[PDB]
């Protein structure tokens, strides 16, 4: 249980070593304006994603950061968001925990 893959197709996405405790915790539970709840895990790094559109500040869950939707680069599953435009760190990924599968490297 050391890397995270896309639950839908198996694309390699991130690693447990890359987990990032933003504000004290790598886990943040959030809702969007449609009332969907997401359990977001913050990672310093990820791969195999495809970032869509240009960054937006609207309704950002992390103060000072602008977000872009992150899809799985292989299957197009919505895996979370890439955050940028902030400070310490300038950028990071917030990935939806239950859309990943964890397993050996
Ligand atoms: Zn996928």
Automatic annotation (TrEMBL):
| Top-level taxon in the UniProt lineage | Bacteria
List of residues binding Zn(2+) = 6, 9, 72, 75
Is the keyword Transferase assigned to this protein?
A: no
Report domain CULT positions. Answer: 1-104
Residues annotated for Ca(2+) binding in this entry: 25, 27
Q: Which UniProt keywords apply?
A: Calcium, Metal-binding, Zinc
**Zinc among the record's keywords?**
yes
Q: Name one GO molecular function term.
A: metal ion binding
This protein is called what?
Cereblon isoform 4
Q: What is the lineage of its organism?
A: Bacteria, Pseudomonadati, Pseudomonadota, Alphaproteobacteria, Rhodospirillales
């Amino acid at each position: 249980a050391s890397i995270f893959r896309c639950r839908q197709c198996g694309q390699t996405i991130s690693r447990r070593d890359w987990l990032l405790p933003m504000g004290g915790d790598h886990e943040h539970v959030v809702f969007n304006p449609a009332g969907m709840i997401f359990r977001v895990w913050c990672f310093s790094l990820a791969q195999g994603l495809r970032l869509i559109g240009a960054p937006s500040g609207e309704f950002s869950w992390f103060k000072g950061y602008d977000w872009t939707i992150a899809l799985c680069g292989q299957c197009g599953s919505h895996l979370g968001w890439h955050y940028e435009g902030g400070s310490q760190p300038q950028t990071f990924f917030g990935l939806i925990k239950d859309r990943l599968a964890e397993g050996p490297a």
